[PDB]
Design a protein around this nucleic acid. Sequence first.
DNA 1: AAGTACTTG
RNA 2: ACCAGGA
DNA 3: CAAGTACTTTTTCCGGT
Lengths: 178, 171, 271, 557, 107, 97, 84, 112
Amino acid sequence: VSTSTFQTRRRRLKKVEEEENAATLQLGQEFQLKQINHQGEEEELIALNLSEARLVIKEALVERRRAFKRSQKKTREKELESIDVLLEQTTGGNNKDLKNTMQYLTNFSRFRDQETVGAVIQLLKSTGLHPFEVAQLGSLACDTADEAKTLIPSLNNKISDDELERILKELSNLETLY
Amino acid sequence: MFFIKDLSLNITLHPSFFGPRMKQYLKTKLLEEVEGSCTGKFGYILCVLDYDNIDIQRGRILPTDGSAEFNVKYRAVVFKPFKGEVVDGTVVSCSQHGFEVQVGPMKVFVTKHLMPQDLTFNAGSNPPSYQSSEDVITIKSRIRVKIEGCISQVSSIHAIGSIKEDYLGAI
Amino acid sequence: RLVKALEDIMVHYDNTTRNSLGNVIQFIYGEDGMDAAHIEKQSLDTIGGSDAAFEKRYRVDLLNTDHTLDPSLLESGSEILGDLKLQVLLDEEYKQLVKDRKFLREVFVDGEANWPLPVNIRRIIQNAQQTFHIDHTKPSDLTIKDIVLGVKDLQENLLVLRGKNEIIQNAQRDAVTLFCCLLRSRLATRRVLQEYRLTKQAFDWVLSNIEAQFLRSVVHPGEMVGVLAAQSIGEPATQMTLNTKKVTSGVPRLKEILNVAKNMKTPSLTV
Amino acid sequence: GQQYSSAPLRTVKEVQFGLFSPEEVRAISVAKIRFPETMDETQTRAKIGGLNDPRLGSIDRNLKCQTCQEGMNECPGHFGHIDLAKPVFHVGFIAKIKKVCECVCMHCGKLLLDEHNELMRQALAIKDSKKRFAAIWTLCKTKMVCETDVPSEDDPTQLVSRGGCGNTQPTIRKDGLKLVGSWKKDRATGDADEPELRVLSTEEILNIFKHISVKDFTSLGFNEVFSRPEWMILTCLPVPPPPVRPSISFNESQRGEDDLTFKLADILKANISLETLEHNGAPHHAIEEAESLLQFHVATYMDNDIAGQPQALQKSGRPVKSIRARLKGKEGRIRGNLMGKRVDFSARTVISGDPNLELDQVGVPKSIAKTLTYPEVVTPYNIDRLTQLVRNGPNEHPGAKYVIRDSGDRIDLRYSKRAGDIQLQYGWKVERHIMDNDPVLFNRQPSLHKMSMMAHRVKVIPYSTFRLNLSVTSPYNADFDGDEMNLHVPQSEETRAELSQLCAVPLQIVSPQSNKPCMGIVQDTLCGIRKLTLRDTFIELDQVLNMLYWVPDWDGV
Amino acid sequence: IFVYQNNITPSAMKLVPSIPPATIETFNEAALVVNITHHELVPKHIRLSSDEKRELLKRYRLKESQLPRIQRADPVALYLGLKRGEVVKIIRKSETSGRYASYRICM
Amino acid sequence: LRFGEMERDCMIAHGAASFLKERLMEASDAFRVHICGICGLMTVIAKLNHNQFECKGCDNKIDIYQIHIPYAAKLLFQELMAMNITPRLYTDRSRDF
Amino acid sequence: KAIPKDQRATTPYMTKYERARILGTRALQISMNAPVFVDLEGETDPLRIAMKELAEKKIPLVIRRYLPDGSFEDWSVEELIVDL
Amino acid sequence: EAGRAALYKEVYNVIASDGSYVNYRHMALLVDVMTTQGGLTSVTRHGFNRSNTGALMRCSFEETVEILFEAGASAELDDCRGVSENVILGQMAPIGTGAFDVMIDEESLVKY
DNA sequence: AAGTACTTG
RNA sequence: ACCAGGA
DNA sequence: CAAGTACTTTTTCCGGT
Ligand SMILES: Nc1ncnc2c1ncn2[C@@H]1O[C@H](COP(=O)(O)CP(=O)(O)OP(=O)(O)O)[C@@H](O)[C@H]1O
Ligand SMILES: [Mg+2]
Ligand SMILES: [Zn+2]
Ligand SMILES: [Zn+2]
Ligand SMILES: [Zn+2]
């Protein structure tokens, strides 16, 4: 038995077209902007930037330890060793996929703290750009608006080069050290 | 990318588990079945969110057998890569054919022919490398690859990527 | 054919009788919402006899020196004489008993009194009598209000349909109409006090029993009354064969009926 | 049993009927189905890559399936296909195929009447697909010309052009499997006298049908997804897998091919002739000869009991068994294999009444209890009871036949070397003998009653008969003149409850058929009751004490 | 209502639906001699308002299909001038309940 | 022993839904087919060993269920298909009412 | 659309079928080594354990009563009147 | 309405001719079934089996193949609400014991 | 065969 | 399969 | 508008050539 969604589409006999996924911001039928949360409400898609992502998983796994020890009642490389330890408690271990992902996130995260990631999220979530672009813009380190408009082609006409460059300059500022 | 997608999963508990550690065994069974898993549809279902508020709902008792079926509703952090997706990754392996790069849970492989011409395969090194007019890509190196296309397969998703285009390559 | 025709018919959780289309066959099962098992050929007394004899039975007039309940029937008897407020209740009682008589006489034109109905009231009274060791000499601890009002209340509790709205609440009244006609005839003030000679406790128990016995007597949603009817019509037709005016009679006439045979064998009028 | 599948298990919520589009047949198909030869790779016993397993199902029980790996009891057969050399009418649809032709223009595929006609727009209004098509056909049959211009929704002076095509429509009549029309004609105003008489080709009808508008056929009975009218004309024929047409395979080097397997080979043989005939120097009549031959076999495979006489009987004189006739009622799939079934845990013997049994019980012979079994799950409450039943074995009365491990495997207590060494674990099933007080469905046919099948309490007794209380005779309509009765044993706690709680004899006492009790005191008891309850009848102390002791609920008073 | 003695020509019968929203009814005098509604077997049929109907359907959670049907051509449907889709509440005497309320939708 | 129509009819009169199911299934027929979620037929080339599922002709290697039906129903369906009728079995419902 | 507990309109009593199905289900679970919510006062039969559990109204089951239009009323065994 | 009353009168007159008695409700149901559709729907293949119930259901009486053939041609969709369809599908029918569903409420389970 | 429903003259 | 039987 | 065809079914369960 596998995983179901919230996207209902009654596909009677009519199999295909399934039109290829791209950076024509044509993601899956599942990865549509107008996605629908279970409480009935239609909520916009959630794409995370590596770090906005890391902070979620960390938090979720930390809260899990809390609940696991509630039922059991009755510095980068130092951040990496500690994560492998939090995982050792809350995860299945057989889930090498998460450990692999956790190391990746820990290494490649651009913004260390929730305070920082907050400000990052504010800045980009005002551009009117599509969830994907916003996430890619948050996790890809670009200097020229061209670097960005080349790596994120979906942007190509959506924003002023100067305005995009203003954002890029303010991302470089928020960028935490190592 | 790296999305948060609301999802559900049907679990058929056996009558022996109809004790008060009900929600517990179900939430745990859900975590076993879903976390670390990978489908094509939603990609890598990496980590289940908000354990404390995982919705069990009522479970219908299946008729000629005793077992009950609950549609566990839940939210999770997923990873589906796409064609055109530009990803920052670390090199893993490196053959005369190209270099496979670890990007999160998945491996994106770069063909010798998807790389700029100047980059040549150097066999004579520990470990084997790719040498440019000024650049060097080997095992531990960090890269930026554009995903050219994906192959949804079993309990993974693998993909072919390029470092030919502008702003792509080593970092 | 009778089975294959009815099979899919059953009683859903709204007492409705529906086929696989949810199409309404009967609004309430068998027009009363009762299970055929919990029904007995009870007699509706009120129906017949002289208008004169009906007066002698159900009429209580505390305003007449002769037609009042004798103080040998109840303790109240003495202080009850000429109570204008109370005689209003007995006037409603008798006026409703007369309404009933006329109604029944429309429903059963020939005056057939014996009709199969739920709750054996006769038996409940009999049981109260041997249960409470009812002494047919000593006057009762019942008030007129104890009786008249008690029956009025008991009726409000004889629930067939439950919905909180006019349509259902009217359908409820309609479904219970004839049972109450019986209940009122059997539980009239004079009758309780003079005939049955019940104490307050005895009468209180007779009421709860009618109620409980009534509630059990209703059909259970899920009952496959399609196959039931099919077999209940069908089985007798099979023993009308298998065992040992001249109109087409028996098996071939039933054939004629179901088939909706246009060219029928013995067509006739009754002018 | 059958193996574990990771597929999510569901129930059928909806059955969506339709017609096989030729492209679907060719898609779903696991083989084509080129040879009329069954198998024997040139005598060499094994299946030919032509008919029955050119990837299909599986003949040899010791050979796993070619497409799915599974084999025999697991493998539902997989379909094949035969690309028919020329299209053919599907027997069942010749009816509709004609009425559809009668409704549409035999040249442009436009409906003979439309929204411009008042009686038509009225019939187009009908919501039911069957009644709508009915009302359409009766109106459109009589329109013998496809109208170019019809009088507009106002004046007859100024007429508006609807669809084109002037063409006269044929007076279609069926000549058994053939459709033949008679176009009115115009010649010097009158003529007919003597009109154009010609047979409508399957292919010509197919093409006209193909051109019928989505709006048009959806206005007719049809649906654009599951049943287009073009799908009533067979182009690609689906080949049912072995499970449907099993080779009743006697001995080793000896056949036993199913009726359908021959009937298909005929279709194959008939096709290869028609095919090679038109690829070769087509003698154009020898062509319409070999065509009609294939149209017949493809008709007589599905239905053989066709009106126009030819009964396509097997060379033995025995008619070929059509698929239609397999499904046709009382004995045959729907009525015989699905509406009723032959069942396991069923037992039947000669019945005889016992005054010493309780009403709700049923005397069951020891043999029948040692035969019939109940699967009881090893629980702590019964762990020790079950280990003794298992110890007793298949031959002692309170014994068991099998032990079923969680390890899916059945242990035969009758042969297993470990039949004593057996040590039950919780969660194992024990296939034990029927024991006293087990609920069982007991019945006597005909079965015109809710009452003719009642739940009884087992009572294992000696002697080969079913024993039953005399008062319980009436509901079943049994007597002891040589009547037999059936017993059915429930297999789970869920169904035991069903019996005990809903259909137990005491529950059935008062019948809803007639609002009266359907069981009473009969014969010896009834005749003897009158005799004893007399004013003349008096009992002396000696008898009187036994008379008392005999009532098991007696107060001792 | 147009009461005719013997017949109305298929000629004049074409004018019947010509003047809507107003409706016309053709009645053979010979049928009207006796009132059918007065007979032993004919119960009180009652025309429902769009509001009454909306209510009947809401209260029993029905689609118009699920409701028992009165024929448009029906003697009682004619006597009342039932229109397609109109519901009739039929009040009949019951040997079971005393009085049973049924409903029929027009056809 | 034949559990005939008449015998089914009493079980329905009783309302012994499970007991009827048992008779027709576990006590007699009962088979397990793999059906497709797109075209509701027994088309699935299920190699339940390798966990490979597939319904080529739908390219569906995912949306597949498994149902328990009397083996005679599996037959009926194949016989109806052989006769060109598609008896598509779906596990979801669209209609309502 | 699932009728809310305050608008429920079905029988407050437990239909003969409901009784039998709950008893059967519980007995099927008890037999499948499910946790028994009552004191087995020396009981070995799962139907008798089910009856016992039902008499003490300590059965964790909920009857979903489907209406003809599809909507349903959820009733707990604990709340249903057992006149049977 | 009169036709229904007459129909019962007439059906009842046959059952009571043998002498035997049948509770009203049964006959009332047969009579009401033949009635509802508008006129007199016969208890024959031209009557009830021609109504708009299930395809698999209707096919199970009289015109078996002919039914499944037209079901195919007009792309009929079986509700699967009929007893018949479930028996054919080997599923628990929505009859008595099948007229509802059973669920474990966790909250009440942890309560005990 | 018997009855009907459905075309065909 | 037809024939012969049983309640 | 009438006679004439093409249609369909006819209880349940349980040894031998
Ligand atoms: N052909 C048949 N079809 C169906 N049921 C039959 C049958 N023959 C007999 N029966 C069953 O058995 C009964 C007839 O028994 P028979 O052997 O003919 C002797 P009888 O003259 O009826 O005497 P008895 O019923 O007083 O004992 C029926 O009431 C019926 O249920
Ligand atoms: Mg006999
Ligand atoms: Zn296979
Ligand atoms: Zn044309
Ligand atoms: Zn498919």
